[PDB]
Amino acid sequence: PHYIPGYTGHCPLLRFSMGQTYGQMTGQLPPAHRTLLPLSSSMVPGYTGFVPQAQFIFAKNCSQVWAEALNDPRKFFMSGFTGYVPRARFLFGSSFPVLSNQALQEFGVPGYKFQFGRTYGHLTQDALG
């Protein structure tokens, strides 16, 4: 249901569009839309009396005019990126793919005096716990 390429005239919002063919930029863009276009046996035609609504219409026979009247992966940035990444010149920890990765998520013996006679490793066990 597109417009044929030869069609001149007016189609809305054609002037602000570009880069597509005339059948695609028109097809992408009213209820009563018709532009695209998506008894007779009880009377003989020689009759000359009167029937209402029978003096008006063509496109069909007289014997038919009385018919019609009656009827987070992939966050890295690769090598040598000459763009700007926030927190790129500040922090560190791994490679430039991982540097650009981590910069995107952050955008949004005591008491030894009184130790006498028990083993030094056993002494540190008391100090640690």
Binding site: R15, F16, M18, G19, T82, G83, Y84, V85, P86, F90
Partner: protein, 426 residues
């Protein structure tokens, strides 16, 4: 990755760029407390071009703000986007300029050049890859021509092979605030041609005419004048910040429109201008932008361009648009106005196209043009000079500051020499 430096001097230059620094702050989406709140992502890979990073996500304006009198800095820090400016970059004296070029250049100026070059080369050396030195100042003042002319002299002798463009504010013909405008203009124009090798100067009157006719505002203050002169200077560097299909960078926007080395006086302009009440009645279409780019009223014209002839023109565009139209239409502008574009140069207009539109619009452009008609912009200052020099009206103030009269005429002799090559190409 390729960074730019902007310089602020003068009362006029400080107010323009403070309005200019907010235009990109809401173009790149930087909040006016220092943090960043941008909508898209594309305005983050080039944020270092015009800004730089600091701890905590608190983004920093890369600018230097210098004036003799600290009155206007008390207003910049009090402004809407003045809490981002770095007070290390706030270098100031204690006395006023006095609206004269003597107490801005040689004697008062000489005891601030060390203080200012120390912080300019601070950021210039910490820069990864310097590109340019933009400067906004007023020619008809005591500081813009006073100290805005030392820095461009003391940068070029220290960076001799880098492009640097300036944004001057030439005094208007028939409306003025001071009575000393040609003294501060002629003595600058010799120095401005000698080392800037690029200018951008349109008077205050043309800004009034655009705000009266093109934009139709009854009471235009200095705000929309500064916004409009900021719009034409945010699109001059848009190819350094946004992608595209056929872009023009600054050094690329230099050899394309400087035909002779001292022939570098240009004429800005902003395309998508309309009235406040006529937004919805106007088709923002690129054949209609350039009809408006190539007039004298809606484009920033201190002097009428039909009085001369266009020598070389740029047209940097912004926004998603077709290339076939803008190629054929610059061809249509060329042949329809063949009497107003020069001969002996077959292609005259640069076609630069960006990919991302500005904020509030869907396409935009900035008119950048070398006109031979700019000769009349310097006739009136010369005609004002010889009407006041011949009586020696204010030569005693310059004599009192240890400054001689011998090179006081060397400035006028060279701008009379300067316009001579303009009139060679009638």
């Amino acid at each position: 990755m390729r960074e730019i430096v902007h310089l602020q001097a003068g009362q006029c230059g400080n107010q323009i760029g403070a309005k200019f620094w907010e235009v990109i702050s809401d173009e790149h989406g930087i909040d006016p407390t220092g943090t960043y709140h941008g909508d898209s992502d594309l305005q983050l890979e080039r944020i270092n071009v015009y800004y730089n990073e600091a701890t905590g996500g608190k983004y920093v304006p890369r600018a230097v703000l210098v004036d003799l009198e600290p009155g206007t800095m008390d207003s910049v820090r009090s402004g809407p986007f003045g809490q981002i400016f770095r007070p290390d970059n706030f270098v100031f004296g204690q006395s006023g300029a006095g609206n004269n070029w003597a107490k801005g250049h040689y004697t008062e100026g000489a005891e601030l050049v060390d203080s200012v070059l120390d912080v300019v080369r601070k950021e210039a050396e910490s820069c990864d890859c310097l590109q340019g030195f933009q400067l906004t100042h007023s020619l008809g003042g005591g500081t813009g021509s006073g100290m805005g002319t030392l820095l461009i002299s003391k940068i070029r002798e220290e960076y001799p092979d880098r492009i640097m463009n300036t944004f001057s504010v030439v005094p208007s013909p028939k409306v003025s605030d001071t009575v000393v405008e040609p003294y501060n203009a002629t003595l600058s124009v010799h120095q401005l041609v000698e080392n800037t090798d690029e200018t951008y100067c349109i008077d205050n009157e043309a800004l009034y005419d655009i705000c009266f006719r093109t934009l139709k505002l009854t009471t235009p203050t200095y705000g929309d004048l500064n916004h409009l002169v900021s719009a034409t200077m945010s699109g001059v560097t848009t190819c350094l910040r946004f992608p595209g299909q056929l872009n023009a960078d600054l050094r690329k926007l230099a050899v394309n429109m400087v035909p002779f080395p001292r022939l570098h006086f240009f004429m800005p302009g902003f395309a998508p201008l309309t009235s406040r009440g006529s937004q919805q009645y106007r088709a923002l279409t690129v054949p209609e932008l350039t009809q408006q780019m190539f007039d004298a009223k809606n484009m920033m014209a201190a002097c009428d361009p039909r009085h001369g002839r266009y020598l070389t023109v740029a047209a940097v565009f912004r926004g998603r648009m077709s290339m076939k139209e803008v190629d054929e239409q610059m061809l249509n502008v060329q042949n329809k106005n063949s009497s107003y574009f020069v001969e002996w140069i077959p292609n005259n207009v640069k076609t630069a196209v960006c990919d991302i539109p500005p904020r509030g619009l869907k396409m935009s452009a900035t008119f950048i043009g070398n006109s031979t008609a700019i000769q009349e912009l310097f006739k009136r200052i010369s005609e004002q000079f010889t009407a006041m020099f011949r009586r020696k009206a204010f030569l005693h103030w310059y004599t009192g500051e240890g400054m001689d009269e011998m090179e006081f005429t060397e400035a006028e002799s060279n701008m009379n020499d300067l316009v001579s090559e303009y009139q060679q190409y009638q």
